[PDB]
Amino acid sequence: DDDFTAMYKVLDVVKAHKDSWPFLEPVDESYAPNYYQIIKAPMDISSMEKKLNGGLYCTKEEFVNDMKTMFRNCRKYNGESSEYTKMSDNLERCFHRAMMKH
Amino acid sequence: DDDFTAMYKVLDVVKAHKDSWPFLEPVDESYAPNYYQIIKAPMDISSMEKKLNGGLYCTKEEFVNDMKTMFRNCRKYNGESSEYTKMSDNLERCFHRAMMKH
Amino acid sequence: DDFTAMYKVLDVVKAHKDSWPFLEPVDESYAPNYYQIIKAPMDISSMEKKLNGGLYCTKEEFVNDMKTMFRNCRKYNGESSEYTKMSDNLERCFHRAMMKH
Amino acid sequence: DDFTAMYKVLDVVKAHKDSWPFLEPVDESYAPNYYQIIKAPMDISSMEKKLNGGLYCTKEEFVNDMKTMFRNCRKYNGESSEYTKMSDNLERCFHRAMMKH
Numbered sequence: 001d002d003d004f005t006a007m008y009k010v011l012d013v014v015k016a017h018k019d020s021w022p023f024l025e026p027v028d029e030s031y032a033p034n035y036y037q038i039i040k041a042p043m044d045i046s047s048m049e050k051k052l053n054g055g056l057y058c059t060k061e062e063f064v065n066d067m068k069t070m071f072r073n074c075r076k077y078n079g080e081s082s083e084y085t086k087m088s089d090n091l092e093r094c095f096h097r098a099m100m101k102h
Numbered sequence: 103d104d105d106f107t108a109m110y111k112v113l114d115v116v117k118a119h120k121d122s123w124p125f126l127e128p129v130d131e132s133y134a135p136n137y138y139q140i141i142k143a144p145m146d147i148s149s150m151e152k153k154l155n156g157g158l159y160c161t162k163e164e165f166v167n168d169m170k171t172m173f174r175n176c177r178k179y180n181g182e183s184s185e186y187t188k189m190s191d192n193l194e195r196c197f198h199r200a201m202m203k204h
Numbered sequence: 205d206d207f208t209a210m211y212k213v214l215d216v217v218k219a220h221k222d223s224w225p226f227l228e229p230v231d232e233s234y235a236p237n238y239y240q241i242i243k244a245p246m247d248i249s250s251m252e253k254k255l256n257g258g259l260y261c262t263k264e265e266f267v268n269d270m271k272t273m274f275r276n277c278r279k280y281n282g283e284s285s286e287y288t289k290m291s292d293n294l295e296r297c298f299h300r301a302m303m304k305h
Numbered sequence: 306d307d308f309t310a311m312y313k314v315l316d317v318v319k320a321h322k323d324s325w326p327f328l329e330p331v332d333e334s335y336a337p338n339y340y341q342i343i344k345a346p347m348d349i350s351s352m353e354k355k356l357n358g359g360l361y362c363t364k365e366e367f368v369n370d371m372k373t374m375f376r377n378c379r380k381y382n383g384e385s386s387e388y389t390k391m392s393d394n395l396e397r398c399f400h401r402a403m404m405k406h
């Protein structure tokens with residue numbers, strides 16, 4: 001198969017994970033005060049989906065980088081001890097297994 | 103062929119233009135004295151890139167308004183006869199061509 | 205020339221489906237004591253930095269860093285590892301590209 | 306087109322009185338552990354090689370390499386270094402040239 005199909009299958013697996021729900025859409029600032037003042041490059045699963053379906057991921061590289069940002073942003077904003085960060089770790093290990101499979 | 107994909111393609115075209123380089127990042131005040139005191143709403147290509155990839159442009163209207171602001175700030179601070187203003191007219195024309203294509 | 209050739213070859217390698225574990229320096233949280241075991245770590249981003257920094261005088265000097273990158277994988281993960289299968293895939297791709305460019 | 310502009314800019318930059326420390330990759334004998342500290346080394350000769358090799362599609366990557374050059378200087382030598390004064394001068398020079406060409 002090809003890189004598109006692989007990335008599509010990976011996102012589907014990631015979205016299905018029990019802890020994906022905080023990462024599905026862009027962060028609502030009413031739930032997270034000054035998120036966009038703190039986070040310079042916001043990233044979420046729906047934006048990755050938009051880029052993928054829009055033919056904007058030429059290679060797996062820029063896909064991994066966006067994933068890397070989504071998790072970096074979580075850690076940065078919520079802290080290492082946050083419940084969101086535990087979920088982020090779980091989702092990261094999920095993204096990793098999926099990459100290895102697809 | 104989606105608002106997101108269209109805006110992504112447009113920004114890429116704009117960044118590639120010969121005169122985009124002074125609009126790529128937020129204005130360095132060391133090159134433009136008291137820029138931030140004069141300009142109430144600063145805007146640049148990297149900020150718009152971050153807004154787009156963050157899922158913050160619901161419609162093209164939102165995007166056009168930021169672009170309008172970016173060029174308004176240039177004319178305001180540098181004046182009609184400035185070399186920056188010639189560049190900002192060229193880039194505005196570039197923004198327009200891209201919006202018609204994508 | 206050699207410069208442009210080395211440039212095109214890294215691009216081909218990065219584009220390969222199995223390049224993603226070789227793109228950045230190894231995260232020790234995924235590979236315990238990697239840096240204690242591997243004495244000369246190498247990754248695609250590091251070679252890109254050397255290339256762009258004018259640190260590759262020869263084509264050979266560059267080919268040795270690539271070779272080290274695959275050697276390190278085999279050494280650390282073993283012959284039967286899933287990483288080694290991807291390393292093999294990335295290696296012949298590298299070779300195919302070197303012959304074309 | 307963008308080529309000619311970037312070529313003229315580099316020529317102007319190379320001609321500047323303070324360009325000489327930035328012309329070639331850093332000699333580690335003058336700067337101890339430079340390559341251990343600086344992860345992305347950049348210099349004018351490397352930028353010339355990329356330009357002449359057709360690796361700058363747009364002015365954007367060219368500006369980014371220039372930004373790296375100066376970032377490296379500041380990082381390694383500090384804000385109060387004589388090299389950093391030279392770096393500021395060369396940056397002002399890069400800027401005038403970019404406006405002209």
Ligand SMILES: C=CCn1cc(C(=O)N(C)C2CCN([C@@H](C)c3ccccc3)CC2)c2cc(C)[nH]c2c1=O
Nearest residue numbers: 021022023025026027028031032073074077078084
């Ligand atoms: C870790 C991922 C990024 N991230 C997402 C947050 C976030 O967005 N949330 C928790 C919710 C807000 C409401 N939404 C809507 C769409 C929804 C969906 C289903 C049921 C109720 C509400 C879901 C995500 C959030 C909130 C803080 C304080 N920090 C963060 C944060 O870092």
Ligand SMILES: C=CCn1cc(C(=O)N(C)C2CCN([C@@H](C)c3ccccc3)CC2)c2cc(C)[nH]c2c1=O
Nearest residue numbers: 064068092095096224225226230231234235277287
């Ligand atoms: C193959 C050669 C180099 N090599 C890389 C490893 C490695 O580092 N990885 C596989 C991951 C680490 C985390 N990153 C992040 C950004 C990521 C990417 C995609 C999904 C989740 C997380 C990607 C590569 C790794 C782990 C072992 C046990 N041996 C190795 C190893 O020999």
Ligand SMILES: C=CCn1cc(C(=O)N(C)C2CCN([C@@H](C)c3ccccc3)CC2)c2cc(C)[nH]c2c1=O
Nearest residue numbers: 325326327330331332335336377378381382388392
């Ligand atoms: C600022 C730019 C990058 N940068 C270059 C250095 C550097 O390499 N130099 C200054 C010289 C070394 C030898 N060469 C030769 C060609 C030469 C030229 C003229 C007289 C003698 C030798 C020129 C660059 C250097 C040294 C420190 C402590 N930090 C740096 C450093 O940050």
Ligand SMILES: C=CCn1cc(C(=O)N(C)C2CCN([C@@H](C)c3ccccc3)CC2)c2cc(C)[nH]c2c1=O
Nearest residue numbers: 124125129130133134176179186368396399400403
């Ligand atoms: C045009 C729109 C916004 N705008 C940006 C300016 C600005 O910031 N610049 C032109 C530079 C500053 C330094 N950077 C670096 C990375 C650079 C790039 C190329 C060569 C040298 C240095 C690029 C933008 C600037 C300066 C005045 C007097 N008015 C303005 C101004 O209205």
